[PDB]
Design an enzyme around this catalytic site. Structure first.
Site, PDB file in Angstrom:
ATOM      1  CG  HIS A   1      -0.246   0.102   2.529  1.00  0.00           C
ATOM      2  ND1 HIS A   1       0.099  -1.013   3.268  1.00  0.00           N
ATOM      3  CD2 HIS A   1       0.155   1.170   3.260  1.00  0.00           C
ATOM      4  CE1 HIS A   1       0.690  -0.636   4.385  1.00  0.00           C
ATOM      5  NE2 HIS A   1       0.741   0.686   4.406  1.00  0.00           N
TER       6      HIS A   1
ATOM      7  CB  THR B   1       0.510   5.470   3.995  1.00  0.00           C
ATOM      8  OG1 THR B   1       0.595   4.098   4.397  1.00  0.00           O
ATOM      9  CG2 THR B   1      -0.192   6.280   5.081  1.00  0.00           C
TER      10      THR B   1
ATOM     11  CG  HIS C   1       6.939   5.439   1.008  1.00  0.00           C
ATOM     12  ND1 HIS C   1       6.544   6.534   1.739  1.00  0.00           N
ATOM     13  CD2 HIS C   1       6.881   4.379   1.851  1.00  0.00           C
ATOM     14  CE1 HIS C   1       6.278   6.162   2.978  1.00  0.00           C
ATOM     15  NE2 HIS C   1       6.471   4.860   3.072  1.00  0.00           N
TER      16      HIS C   1
ATOM     17  CB  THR D   1       6.989   0.358   3.312  1.00  0.00           C
ATOM     18  OG1 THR D   1       7.124   1.751   3.617  1.00  0.00           O
ATOM     19  CG2 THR D   1       7.915  -0.474   4.222  1.00  0.00           C
TER      20      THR D   1
HETATM   21  N1  A2P Z   1       3.568   8.962  12.245  1.00  0.00           N
HETATM   22  C1  A2P Z   1       3.275   8.148  11.116  1.00  0.00           C
HETATM   23  N2  A2P Z   1       3.278   9.061  10.136  1.00  0.00           N
HETATM   24  C2  A2P Z   1       3.031   8.668   8.849  1.00  0.00           C
HETATM   25  N3  A2P Z   1       2.782   7.347   8.566  1.00  0.00           N
HETATM   26  C3  A2P Z   1       2.779   6.417   9.562  1.00  0.00           C
HETATM   27  C4  A2P Z   1       3.026   6.822  10.839  1.00  0.00           C
HETATM   28  N4  A2P Z   1       2.972   5.731  11.664  1.00  0.00           N
HETATM   29  C5  A2P Z   1       2.692   4.649  10.900  1.00  0.00           C
HETATM   30  N5  A2P Z   1       2.570   5.060   9.595  1.00  0.00           N
HETATM   31  C6  A2P Z   1       2.289   4.549   8.274  1.00  0.00           C
HETATM   32  O1  A2P Z   1       1.214   3.814   8.334  1.00  0.00           O
HETATM   33  C7  A2P Z   1       1.503   2.384   7.650  1.00  0.00           C
HETATM   34  C8  A2P Z   1       1.335   1.292   8.680  1.00  0.00           C
HETATM   35  O2  A2P Z   1       2.088   1.614   9.825  1.00  0.00           O
HETATM   36  P1  A2P Z   1       2.059   0.597  11.082  1.00  0.00           P
HETATM   37  O3  A2P Z   1       2.558  -0.728  10.651  1.00  0.00           O
HETATM   38  O4  A2P Z   1       2.918   1.117  12.165  1.00  0.00           O
HETATM   39  O5  A2P Z   1       0.624   0.467  11.593  1.00  0.00           O
HETATM   40  C9  A2P Z   1       2.728   2.403   7.175  1.00  0.00           C
HETATM   41  O6  A2P Z   1       2.708   2.551   5.678  1.00  0.00           O
HETATM   42  C10 A2P Z   1       3.422   3.613   7.815  1.00  0.00           C
HETATM   43  O7  A2P Z   1       4.218   4.252   6.901  1.00  0.00           O
HETATM   44  P2  A2P Z   1       5.553   3.500   6.369  1.00  0.00           P
HETATM   45  O8  A2P Z   1       5.140   2.499   5.259  1.00  0.00           O
HETATM   46  O9  A2P Z   1       6.528   4.526   5.808  1.00  0.00           O
HETATM   47  O10 A2P Z   1       6.202   2.766   7.496  1.00  0.00           O
END
Ligand code: A2P
Length: 213
Positions: A65, A67, A144, A146
């Site tokens: 995904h 985000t 992006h 991940t």
């Molecule tokens: N403070 C945060 N700010 C922006 N995105 C977040 C934040 N915390 C978690 N995420 C994003 O939400 C998604 C799921 O996070 P999690 O697994 O912790 O629930 C991930 O894509 C993560 O981004 P990212 O993909 O860059 O890590």
């Protein structure tokens, strides 16, 4: 009504699998490449060669995904404001195509760079507090997918790593291809930062919706 954990574009099974495979192939190729093997000391402190697929052991399970807004059920600042926008409500459940321009790797994260269309950029949050790493870069640069994380790495790091890489590319356009991989040319931005710039933009299908944990 509480909000999702986060909003974003959730790739289809086919798209996820294809991107996941491309990412795995990239880590494999990069780990076998001499330009990378020589620069291993700027990547880890530990001393052979490193299988990056194991290095990025924490990988998303299931569908990949991109985000848009992390909401934490409404606890994140700006969450309520984001979710109440018409374009969010209108775009909820709608299919999109995301353009992947590059794959990237750092000592912390592996991921894919998303270049949002103007339409999709309307779904990108414009929050009050920004990371200063996004300064001077166009909105949505942080976009992006991940693909993997090192063990003690925390979420949202991949977005930060990408911005750091892009604010290297704008200032210097930094690298002539240190290698020529079959999907594109390979850049070494130093400090364990690597970028595969795809000769060929990868298109992935995704659905804009909310994840609720
Ligand atoms: N403070 C945060 N700010 C922006 N995105 C977040 C934040 N915390 C978690 N995420 C994003 O939400 C998604 C799921 O996070 P999690 O697994 O912790 O629930 C991930 O894509 C993560 O981004 P990212 O993909 O860059 O890590």
């Amino acid at each position: 009504d509480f909000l999702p954990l986060y909003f974003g574009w959730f790739l289809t099974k086919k798209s996820s699998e294809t991107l996941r495979k491309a990412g795995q192939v990239f880590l494999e190729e990069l780990g076998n490449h001499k330009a990378f093997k020589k620069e291993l000391r700027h990547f880890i402190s530990g001393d052979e060669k490193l299988e990056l697929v194991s290095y990025f052991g924490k990988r998303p399970p299931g569908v990949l995904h991109c985000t848009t807004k992390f909401c934490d059920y409404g606890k994140a600042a700006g969450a309520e404001e984001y979710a109440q926008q018409e374009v969010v409500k209108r775009s909820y459940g709608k299919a999109f195509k995301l353009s992947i321009s590059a794959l990237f790797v750092t000592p912390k994260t592996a991921g894919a760079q998303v270049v949002l269309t103007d339409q999709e950029l309307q779904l990108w949050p414009s929050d009050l507090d920004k990371p200063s790493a996004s300064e001077g870069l166009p909105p949505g640069s942080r976009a992006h997918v991940t693909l993997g994380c090192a063990a003690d790495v925390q979420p949202a790091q991949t977005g930060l790593d990408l911005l750091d890489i892009l604010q290297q590319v704008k200032g210097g356009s930094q690298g002539e291809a240190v290698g020529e991989l079959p999907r594109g040319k390979l850049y070494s931005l130093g400090k364990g930062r690597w970028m595969l710039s795809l000769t060929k933009k990868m298109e992935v299908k995704a659905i804009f919706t909310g994840y609720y944990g």
